Ligand code: HEM
């Protein structure tokens with residue numbers, strides 16, 4: 007069989023069913039299954055997504071070795087994913103030297119210096135956010151954060167990636183908003199894990215998990231802008247300026263544009279929802295932050311790149327949220343060679359997995375781990391936190407390239423919104439929040455809260 011491998015290496019795990027492997031155990035979802043396995047088996051364990059062996063690892067030295075020490079050499083790519091179509095060229099899907107080349111060609115886009123240049127742009131839609139929120143707070147109707155934050159995240163994306171400027175909550179039907187707004191335990195991807203041999207089938211059928219129509223709209227919408235700016239501060243331009251030299255192709259450039267939307271749309275919006283839920287169910291933290299924000303920005307002063315880094319309690323709130331809700335859930339690299347790391351034989355072809363969610367909630371590193379307690383990130387206690395236990399942006403050469411941009415994007419939305427409003431539970435607010443038993447880190451029920459004007 008293929009299912010004998012962990013039994014042979016003396017590695018414990020749950021016993022796999024033929025063909026299926028352990029996937030029925032995802033019925034309660036990745037994270038609950040990860041927690042269970044941690045408790046039941048210890049520091050290392052194995053399971054099978056279908057015939058695919060996955061070794062979980064939770065020792066910080068070993069995690070360091072995989073994520074940083076042996077990245078370029080051994081643990082370079084994520085778990086194969088498909089069908090992708092032309093998206094094979096997206097950085098996050100790309101493999102080995104094409105990844106190394108893409109990552110280089112795109113790293114200077116995400117510098118502090120280029121980020122500081124984008125703060126004015128990400129600020130103006132904080133204002134747009136307020137005015138849409140006020141229209142909902144002067145009419146004391148409970149608000150669904152995912153639509154209004156979704157509208158906001160969506161606003162920052164189009165602006166920061168193509169210079170297109172819209173109020174997606176208000177022009178929700180402009181052509182540029184439709185395509186762009188468009189789960190690994192849904193019927194489709196569970197089937198991909200049992201029948202991964204079916205991927206090269208869909209590839210030759212140009213069936214793509216990225217719908218073939220959105221990809222066509224932006225391939226052409228990009229080339230319109232490309233040739234309307236060429237010739238006559240955003241991500242697209244920064245990429246156009248890069249291929250003005252091994253340099254970035256034209257279809258390669260459309261693909262990265264798409265990964266950036268997918269990356270910062272549901273994530274920026276989802277995280278902000280998780281932070282407003284905790285702010286509302288912990289109103290002292292909410293007050294403590296409103297004070298810190300008014301002290302650095304008095305009279306509702308507009309935030310700047312520099313003032314944002316000045317805020318310590320703000321950063322603590324963000325970091326403690328991502329501890330409870332690390333939206334990647336897991337990190338993963340494919341072992342490309344027989345290797346021994348930190349005293350353990352890892353055979354070629356195993357997927358190596360770091361169960362972030364489960365370690366963020368591990369009582370052996372965290373006190374009262376399910377309690378929302380920002381103080382664990384105080385300049386006092388922030389030093390007692392293992393950066394290979396807390397990894398909401400991954401770690402090493404393949405960590406989240408957009409990390410600085412995402413923290414800034416979120417913090418700008420939070421500052422402007424707590425400058426103006428307070429957030430209180432409704433009776434229809436789900437307390438305590440229940441995580442989706444599905445395949446995405448998101449709430450069972452969408453977070454609804456009451457909004458009031460300061
Ligand atoms: C709060 C929001 C976000 C979180 C928590 C987050 C988290 C992550 C994590 C955990 C990874 C994988 C890291 C690893 O495997 O070690 C990742 C990868 C990535 N993220 Fe983010 N991310 C966020 C937002 C963004 C944004 C806004 C962008 C915008 C460009 C972005 C672009 C990427 C890319 C391109 C990768 C793949 C990097 C590579 O393989 O070279 N992400 N993110």
Ligand SMILES: CC(C)(C)OC(=O)N[C@@H](CS[C@H](Cc1ccccc1)C(=O)NCc1cccnc1)Cc1ccccc1
Nearest residue numbers: 084085086087098099190265268269270273333334338406
């Ligand atoms: C089947 C299996 C689970 C093994 O593989 C994958 O999920 N791998 C992805 C390709 S790695 C990359 C990193 C990533 C993936 C999934 C969750 C978090 C981070 C990616 O794509 N980040 C878009 C994005 C999201 C959040 C933060 N930053 C970036 C496929 C993909 C997902 C979503 C949009 C586009 C592509």
